A paper describes a structure:
Phosphopeptide antigens are naturally processed and presented on human tumour cells by class I and class II [name] molecules. We defined a canonical motif, involving a phosphorylation at position 4 and a positively charged side chain at position 1 (R/K), accounting for ˜ 50% of the [name]-A2 phosphopeptide repertoire. For phosphopeptides with this canonical motif (hereafter referred to as canonical phosphopeptides), the phosphate moiety could act as a “phosphate surface anchor”, mediating extensive contacts to [name]-A2. To address this, we determined [name]-A2 complex structures of three canonical phosphopeptide antigens (RQApSlSISV, termed PKD2 and derived from Protein Kinase D2; RQApSIELPSMAV, termed RQA_V and derived from Lymphocyte Specific Protein 1 (LSP-1); RQIpSQDVKL, termed RQI and derived from adenosine monophosphate deaminase 2 ([name])) in both phosphorylated and non-phosphorylated states.
A third canonical phosphopeptide (RQI) was solved in phosphorylated (RQIp) and non-phosphorylated (RQInp) forms in complex with [name]-A2, to 1.7Å ([name]-A2-RQIp) and 2.1Å ([name]-A2-RQInp) respectively. RQIp exhibits a 75-fold enhanced binding to [name]-A2 relative to RQInp (Kd 25.5 nM versus 1925 nM, respectively). As with previous structures there was little difference observed in overall [name] structure (rmsd 0.62Å) for both complexes. However, unlike PKD2 and RQA_V epitopes, RQIp and RQInp peptides showed no conformational rearrangement (rmsd 0.39Å), although RQIp exhibited phosphate-mediated contacts (left) similar to those of other canonical phosphopeptides. As a result, the molecular surfaces of RQIp (left) and RQInp (right) accessible for recognition are very similar. Therefore the RQInp peptide closely mimics the main chain conformation of its phosphorylated counterpart, suggesting that, other than the phosphate moiety, the antigenic features exposed to the TCR would be very similar for RQIp and RQInp. Firstly, in [name]-A2-RQInp, residues E63 and K66 from the α1-helix interact with one another and form a cooperative stabilising hydrogen-bonding network with the peptide backbone amide and carbonyl groups of Q2 (left).
Numbering used by the authors:
A (entry chain A): 1 to 275
B (entry chain C): 1 to 9
C (entry chain B): 2 to 99
The structure:
Amino acid sequence: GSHSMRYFFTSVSRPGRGEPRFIAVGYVDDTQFVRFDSDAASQRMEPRAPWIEQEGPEYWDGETRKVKAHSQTHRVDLGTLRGYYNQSEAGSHTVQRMYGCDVGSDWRFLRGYHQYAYDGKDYIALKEDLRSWTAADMAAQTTKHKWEAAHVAEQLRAYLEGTCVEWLRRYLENGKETLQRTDAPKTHMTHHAVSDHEATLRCWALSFYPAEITLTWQRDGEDQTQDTELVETRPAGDGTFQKWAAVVVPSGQEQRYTCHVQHEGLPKPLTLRWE
Amino acid sequence: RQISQDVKL
Amino acid sequence: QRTPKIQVYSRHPAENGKSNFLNCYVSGFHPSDIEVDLLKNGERIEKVEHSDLSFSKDWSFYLLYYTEFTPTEKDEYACRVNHVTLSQPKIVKWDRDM
Ligand code: NA
């Protein structure tokens, strides 16, 4: 099974006073491990998972230095894009950036990412070949021209295929007690009468990790979809996740219906049946 | 571990 | 501008008189400025924390607001959300079955 390291950055201009609001977070898989908040008192990269705390002073100094430099660049970027897009200094705008790498089932490099949005829309993104750029518009095109001339993709490719994968693997080992523990969903079904004639079957998946999961309803062994409802996967707040899927059925016919649960923590898919 | 290169739009 | 999806729920299955955690998960929103309060019988709960801002593949933001609580038979809980996309604060009642 695969693993990822991701860094997410949000910069929001504050045209009334001062510098942009800047928030950075780093994830390994679905586990946040670092943060930087411009509005917090420390002004340092801070730990958010026990296993990154093993890292020494030089790591924290180096990660603080890099994230602060990055925040100043986003401040510049906000000014640059406001210029590109002919916008006034009066409104607030958002630059987002995400970068990172996956390792595959063979524990080697699988994919690299490095992409930006402006005011919630795609701006520029490194393609899967880690050699070319997708520029959404003519503003992003001028960024692309600059970056191609400066060999920005080569410098990113080296990080993504090297440092990124190497440190991801380091974290996965140092944090293995949780990072390489799969928490299979804790599943049950509940039953709610809607009328004398129909009832809701709700299939629960609780306390699972990682977040990726599939819940499917069947009737007489065939996928259903009609008269179903499926909430978006949500965080429990303890590092695990929750989801449910529901189906409305004729009362007395509950036994026909099965909930199917797929998750990395489950050797074989689970089947739940009210009966 | 963050990237070192300081890329600007 | 994208309006926030809202889910209100407990960390652990709700059992009256047993301590727990009340969650309000707001996602799919842009821009990121948002007001989120957890309420007990219409009144704002004061000791409410939230996760660090992050966003999904489509660039829309998500946050979890949460506080310790002890559910009872009578008490009502709710999540009140204001965002630029909303005419008035949207209130979502906690339903222990959801
Ligand atoms: Na301001």
